[PDB]
Every structure is written in C-alpha cells, then in structure tokens.
C-alpha cells in the first residue's frame, strides 16, 4: 500500500541502490505503475534503462518476491507495441523467463508463461526466437499431468493462450517440428471442460489449418475434426467462432480433407449457422459452404440432402452484404460442378429472384460472380432445351432489365458475359 | 485473427 504512485526517478533510485530490499520496493512500485489501468509510463521505464536490471532480477532465486514483481513488470512492458516488446527481448529476457518456467512457485512460473506469451504474440520473428531458445519443452512439461482439472483454472488458461500464440502468424508459419510437438497437447486441451481453454484451443487450431494442405493434413490426421464439429454446436459464441474458422480452413484443402468434416456431421449444424444472429457467423458459415459446393458432386449432394439449399437461398435473399457475397460464391461453385439434376433443384428452390436483385449492388466483383452463375445455369438449361423457360423466369423478376444495364458496364469482364447472355439467350 | 495476441496484467 506504500508503493503507490512512485516517480520514475524514485524507482530508478531504489533499484540503483546496493540494497536488495530497496530494489524490491522500487520494482513493486514499477509494477503498480504498469498495472495502473490508465496509460502506464512504459516508454519512460524503458528509456531509464531498467529493463536489463529487471531481467537480472529474474535470476535472483533466493528472493522469489522480486522475481514475481519483475516478471509481472516485464510482462506488461511486453504487452505494448512491437518496439516496446523488442526492448524486453533485447534485455535478454527470453532465456530468463524460460528458466522461471521451472520455478517452484506456480504464480511465478505463470508469469513466465504470461510474458513469453506476449513476446511470441508479437510476430513470427519473436515466435521463432522463443522456440529456438527451447521454450516448448518446459511449457508442455507444465501440462504433463493425469488430469488437467487438478491444475489451477487461470494457470491452465494462460498456458493454453501462450501455446496458441506459438501457433499464430503465417509469414512464416511455425516450424513443422514445433507444430507436431504441440499438437498432441493441443488436442488434449481441446477436450477440457473450461470454455476459455476450448476457445483458445480452437483458435490455436484455426491458425495451423490456415495454410497449405500439408498443414491442414497434419491437423486432420490427429482426429480433431469430430471434436471441432462437436464444439461447432456449442452455446458460447466465443467457442463457436474459432471452431467455425477451423472447419472453414480445413475445407479449403483437398476434397478428401473436405470429406472428413462432412463425415463428422458438420452440415447438420449449418441450419443454425446460416441463420445465426451474429452477422460474422453467417459470413463465416456461408464462406465455408462455398468451399463445399466447390467440391465433388456427391459432396454437393450432401448439402442437398441436409436441406441446406433453402438456407443458401435465404442468406442470398436477406443478409449482410458481406454474407450475401459469400452466398453468390457458393451458388457459382454449386452451378459449375453440380449436375443438371442438382442445378434444377437449386432453381426450383427459388434462387433466381434473389440472385437477380443482387445485380443492383454496387460491387464490381459480386456482379461477375453472379453473371458467371447465370451463365452456368443456362449452360445446363441448354442440355434440357428449356433455355426459353429460364429466360422467362429471369424476365418475370425484373432480371433481364438489370442485365441490360450491365451490358454497358465499365468493367470489361462484366459487359462481356452480359452481352454474351443477352445475345445467346435473350 | 481472433483474440488479442498481447495481454497486460493490470488487475483493478
């Protein structure tokens, strides 16, 4: 209570003293400034040249209090800008914090986990540096227990959060050898009862799946897709969000990888996802659907069997534009690879009207994506001879009148398909 | 793209 509101100069004065206690008091004061909720004087702490002195206190084993005070202190300094996080790493904090992971005091080792989390969370460079210092083995060792429930709640949460940061960022992506080293424990954290652990766990996965098919594969081969589909139907939005992102990334890969999420029973959840109150959930859901309709024909059939086509029509009809744009993509991929019988069913569900009303939108790309679909539908109509019957349906919903305007559009690729449609069919 | 990649421990 007597270390509240110290001046930065006072903190340096006590730390520069030859008295261990005086240093401890000043260090605790420095922390209380950083933990003051309104704009802490980080830059001033750095320009004072204290960081190096804080890092050296992390080594004082005999005095565990100052270890905690300094770990806490540096943690907040590392939570700032990349320039401020760089200062902590420059002070030689990485190897010091990794040493604290073996500390007998859980509350101290938790700070090391917290700190290293901020450092790796900065970017790929520091992420890889934390890994090169050998921070993974210690971290994973802290979770080497029969049951995770016995571990402290907050302690388990921060550990998970730190691990998710070591799987974060893309350019470059985390070392393959490091990802394999963490996955097994990540799959274990993906079955824990705590929601915050499941959330961060799903985010960790969503990071790994984000990339080439080789990255997606090593995650799929761990057999987590089923667990993700289970989490995909959770009540907590914070949990469903990353789960949907993960599944959304897995379906961007091979059709075999895409088939795994179908076998898991993911499509049975989309009736809720495609009508989910939150707008972004619909956008992510529809985006995932577009990567499924772009697969095989038997895969497109799965979507038809689950009666998800009507939902795509509803989302194409009334939703946030961003979501409606994803809907257009879903239809386009659906009409390009789907059979005639499939495209027919799509039309009888009432896809035309809502697909024509989106031609009024002022987005250059969606128009291309739509017109492309229209061409694909006619492409099937010719195989039935009912190109005339289709033209009429488009004409009765003020569709032709809008294609007439796109026939004279600025973008070159637009008027190409438009004029080609007016001429060939109308 | 999810949660903040940096946490400051500033309790009350």
SS3 track for A100-124: HCCCCCHHHHHHHHHHHHHHHHHCH
With a CB cutoff of 8 Å and minimum separation 6, the contacts of A138 are A98, A101, A102
Residues on chain B touching A206 (C-beta within 8 angstroms)? 2
Residue of chain A minimizing CA distance to B2: A203
From A239, A244, A247, A154, select the one nearest A200 (Cα to Cα): A239
Mutating which of B1, B5, B12 best tests the A interface, going by the most A Cβ atoms within 10 A? Answer: B5
DSSP letter, residue A349: T
Check CB contact of A165 with chain B, cutoff 8 Å. Answer: yes
Give the resolution value in Å: 2.8
Q: How far is A203 from chain B (nearest CA, A)?
A: 7
Secondary structure letter of residue A91 according to DSSP? T
Half-sphere exposure of A346 (CA within 13 A, CB side): 33
Residue A213, domain extent: 1-426
Q: Judged by CB atoms within 8 Å, which residues 63-92 of A form the interface with B?
A: 72, 75-76, 78-80, 85
- Select the residue from A79, A97, A170 to test the B interface by mutation, using most B Cβ atoms within 10 A: A79
Contact B3 A200 (CB under 8 A): yes
Residues A380/A344, Cβ–Cβ less than 8 Å:
yes
Phi/psi of residue A182, each to 5°? -100, -35
| Technique used by the depositors | X-ray
Phi first, then psi: what are they for A146, rounded to 5°?
-55, -45
Domain total of chain A = 1
CATH number, position A214:
1.25.10.10
- Measured between CB atoms, which of A37, A114, A118 is closest to B10? A37
Please report the number of interchain residue pairs, chain A to chain B, with beta-carbon separation below 8 angstroms.
48
Name, in order, each residue with C-beta under 8 angstroms of A254's C-beta and a sequence gap of 6 or more.
A213
Breakpoints of chain A, after residues (C–N > 2.5 Å)? none
CA distance A82 to chain B (A): 10
List the one residue out of A292, A243, A240, A242 whose CA is nearest residue A263: A292
Instruction: Report the interhelical angle of A255-264 vs A237-250 (nearest 10°).
Output: 140
Helices A153-165 + A106-122 axis angle, to 10: 20
Whole-angstrom distance, CA of residue A56 vs CA of residue A51: 9
Residue with tokens 């009736």: A271
Alpha-carbon Rg for chain B, nearest whole angstrom, is: 9
Cα–Cα distance, A137 to A387 (Å, whole number): 65
Give the separation between CA A350 and CA A309, rounded to whole angstroms.
Answer: 10
- Mention every residue, 6+ apart, whose C-beta is less than 8 A from residue A244: A232, A273, A281, A284, A285, A288
Rg over CA atoms, chain A: 28
A200 contacts on B by Cβ (under 8 Å):
3
- Exposed/middle/buried for A274, CB within 10 Å: 0-12, 13-18, 19+? buried
């Amino acid at each position: 209570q007597g270390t509240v509101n110290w001046s930065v100069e006072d903190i340096v004065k006590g730390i520069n003293s030859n008295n261990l206690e005086s240093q401890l008091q000043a260090t605790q004061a420095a922390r209380k400034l950083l933990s003051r909720e309104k704009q802490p004087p980080i830059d001033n702490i750095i320009r004072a040249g204290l960081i190096p002195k804080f890092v050296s206190f992390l080594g004082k084993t005999d005095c565990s209090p100052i270890q905690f005070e300094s770990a806490w202190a540096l943690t907040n300094i590392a939570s700032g800008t990349s320039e401020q996080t760089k200062a902590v790493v420059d002070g030689g904090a990485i190897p010091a914090f990794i040493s604290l992971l073996a500390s007998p005091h859980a509350h101290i080792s938790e700070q090391a986990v917290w700190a290293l989390g901020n450092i790796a969370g900065d970017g790929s460079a520091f992420r890889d540096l934390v890994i090169k210092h050998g921070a993974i083995d210690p971290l994973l060792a802290l979770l080497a227990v029969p049951d995770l429930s016995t571990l402290a709640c907050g302690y388990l949460r921060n550990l998970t959060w730190t691990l998710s940061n070591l799987c974060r960022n893309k350019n470059p992506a985390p070392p393959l050898d490091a990802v394999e080293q963490i996955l097994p424990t990540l799959v274990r954290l993906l079955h824990h009862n705590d929601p915050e652990v499941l959330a961060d766990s799903c985010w960790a996965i969503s990071y790994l799946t984000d990339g080439p098919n080789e990255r997606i594969e090593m995650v799929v081969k761990k057999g987590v897709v089923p667990q993700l589909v289970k989490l995909l139907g959770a009540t907590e939005l914070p949990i469903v969000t990353p789960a949907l992102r993960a599944i959304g990334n897995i379906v961007t890969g091979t059709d075999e990888q895409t088939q795994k999420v179908i076998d898991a029973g993911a499509l049975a959840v989309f009736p809720s996802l495609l009508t989910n109150p939150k707008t972004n959930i619909q956008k992510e859901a529809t985006w995932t659907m577009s990567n499924i309709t772009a697969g095989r024909q038997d895969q497109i059939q799965q979507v038809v069997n689950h009666g998800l086509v009507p939902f795509l029509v509803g989302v194409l009809s009334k939703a946030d534009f961003k979501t409606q744009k994803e809907a257009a993509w879903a239809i386009t991929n659906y009409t390009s690879g789907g059979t005639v019988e499939q495209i027919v069913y799509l039309v009888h569900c009432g896809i035309i009207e809502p697909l024509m009303n989106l031609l009024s939108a002022k987005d250059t790309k969606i128009i291309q994506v739509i017109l492309d679909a229209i061409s694909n539908i006619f492409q099937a109509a010719e195989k039935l001879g009912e190109t005339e019957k289709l033209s009429i349906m488009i004409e009765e919903c003020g569709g032709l009148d809008k294609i007439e305007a796109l026939q004279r559009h600025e973008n070159e690729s637009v008027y190409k398909a438009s004029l080609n449609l007016i001429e060939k069919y109308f | 793209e999810g949660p903040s990649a940096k946490k400051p421990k500033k309790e009350a």
